[PDB]
């Protein structure tokens, strides 16, 4: 599924990402935009052989099982294929674990490089939630 | 689809029923409960030959076209079958027209008899939206 901007913001709020660990909603919308372009079916292969999956491009090295990432962990206890669903629930719940890892939203490179320090409220401006 | 209580409240809010024409969210959840028991696929045949459809039991006499209600109107410009969808959008938008008809939520008998004058906030108590 390709989400519209305001539709994604609404769903993220529903699932409790609004101010989760102090990260305002616009931070999450901004991340998704630059990671996946709002596409739940995005995948990107990493040089190390790992794969990132879904709307927040969650990495198979640590977080999900794709059965083809030699010597990896499965810290969110899920198949990577669940993170490609139209339903963002599993992506969200895995994201909550990641952001609670100690490094916060710096675990998403695109968030660190393109969202951090900007005016993220612009990402939810003009949306009914 | 059979909705859970808190899930329905969230979706109604998303679609802008919260305080629509001054009707708080709990009023809408209460209505749906007693009309349909949270079931989008509910139908009930009226003595006059008309049929009520969906989560808010919207009547074919005035509001939708089912092709079998002799001499009826289609004021929401929709097939009645659209009001049975898992997606509540069409029910909601037709509901907004009805409640703007002049009689408010008195157009739902079960709302008038079971919700009106009660403490409707109890219907959304314990829900994250
Ligand atoms: Cl942090
Ligand atoms: Cl009124
Ligand atoms: Na893995
Ligand atoms: Na009709």
From Swiss-Prot, chains A, B:
Give a single Pfam family match.
Lys
* Further details from the record: Lysozyme C is capable of both hydrolysis and transglycosylation; it also shows a slight esterase activity. It acts rapidly on both peptide-substituted and unsubstituted peptidoglycan, and slowly on chitin oligosaccharides.
Reply yes or no: does the keyword Disulfide bond apply.
yes
What protein name is recorded for this chain? Lysozyme C
- The residues covered by the C-type lysozyme domain are 1-129
Task: Note the InterPro entries from the entry.
Answer: Glyco_hydro_22, Glyco_hydro_22_CS, Glyco_hydro_22_lys, Lysozyme-like_dom_sf
Q: What is its main location?
A: secreted
- What EC number is given for this enzyme? 3.2.1.17
**Residues reported to bind substrate:** 101
Q: What does this protein do?
A: Lysozymes have primarily a bacteriolytic function; those in tissues and body fluids are associated with the monocyte-macrophage system and enhance the activity of immunoagents. Has bacteriolytic activity against M.luteus.
Q: Which residues form the active site?
A: 35, 52
Q: Which organism is it from?
A: Gallus gallus
Q: Name one GO biological process term.
A: defense response to Gram-positive bacterium
Q: Which UniProt keywords apply?
A: Allergen, Antimicrobial, Bacteriolytic enzyme, Disulfide bond, Glycosidase, Hydrolase, Secreted, Signal
Which reaction does this chain catalyze? Hydrolysis of (1->4)-beta-linkages between N-acetylmuramic acid and N-acetyl-D-glucosamine residues in a peptidoglycan and between N-acetyl-D-glucosamine residues in chitodextrins
Subunit arrangement?
Monomer.
